[PDB]
Amino acid sequence: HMGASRLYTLVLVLQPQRVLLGMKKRGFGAGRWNGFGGKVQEGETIEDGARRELQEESGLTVDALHKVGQIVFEFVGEPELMDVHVFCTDSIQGTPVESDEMRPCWFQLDQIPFKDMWPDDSYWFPLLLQKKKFHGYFKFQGQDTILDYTLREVDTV
Ligand SMILES: COc1nc(N)nc2c1ncn2[C@H]1C[C@H](O)[C@@H](COP(=O)(O)O)O1
């Protein structure tokens, strides 16, 4: 996937029988449940950015984040690809609380609200839930339509 890309993070708190999602309240993807995350800033590592965004959006801190995936997004007409680094943790510190950006809620693993999530999630979530590492690519036309996609399992994220 050639071209300048912009680094983002996505963090899924995934425990044995539940997963934490945030309802995005403003900005990009508002009105959909997602993992926690954002742009990676100058002067922080990708993992530092993931932690930062988890704290900003949910108040939670974490001992260890694990790399579980990479998803590259093309938005038709937008020059930069989005290079999203996906992370998982089971253990968390604190109780999740609402932020300006996100309203947190736990979901049982058989009640994941896919119809109110970004449409790409239904493709790669099953791999996340199976503990399989993956590389994904999705080309979107606007916010609702996937024109192209690829998805595979990887041994190294
Ligand atoms: C298009 O399909 C997509 N599907 C999913 N599941 N997540 C996506 C996504 N596009 C972007 N993100 C994620 C990355 C970031 O966590 C956040 C954006 O950063 P903020 O604008 O909220 O600061 O949204």
Tell me, in Å, the resolution of the deposited structure.
Answer: 1.8
User: What CATH number corresponds to the domain at position 50?
Assistant: 3.90.79.10
Q: What tokens appear for 65 in the block?
A: 């984040």
* Binding site listing for 2-oxo-dATP: 9, 34, 36-39, 118-121
Regarding the beta carbon of 74 and ligand 1, being less than 6 Å apart is answered no
Distance CA 26, CA 51 (A): 20
Q: Rounded to the nearest 5 degrees, what angle is found at the Cα of 99, between the Cα atoms of 30 and 137?
A: 40
Overall number of domains in the chain? 1
Domain carrying residue 46: 1-157
Distance CA 81, CA 24 (A): 21
Please indicate the experimental technique that yielded this structure.
X-ray
DSSP letter for 46, please: H
Regarding the beta carbon of 119 and ligand 1, being less than 6 Å apart is answered no
Regarding the beta carbon of 87 and ligand 1, being less than 6 Å apart is answered no
Amino acid at 118: W
Nearest to 25 by CA among 56, 69, 70: 56
Q: What tokens appear for 9 in the block?
A: 């993070």
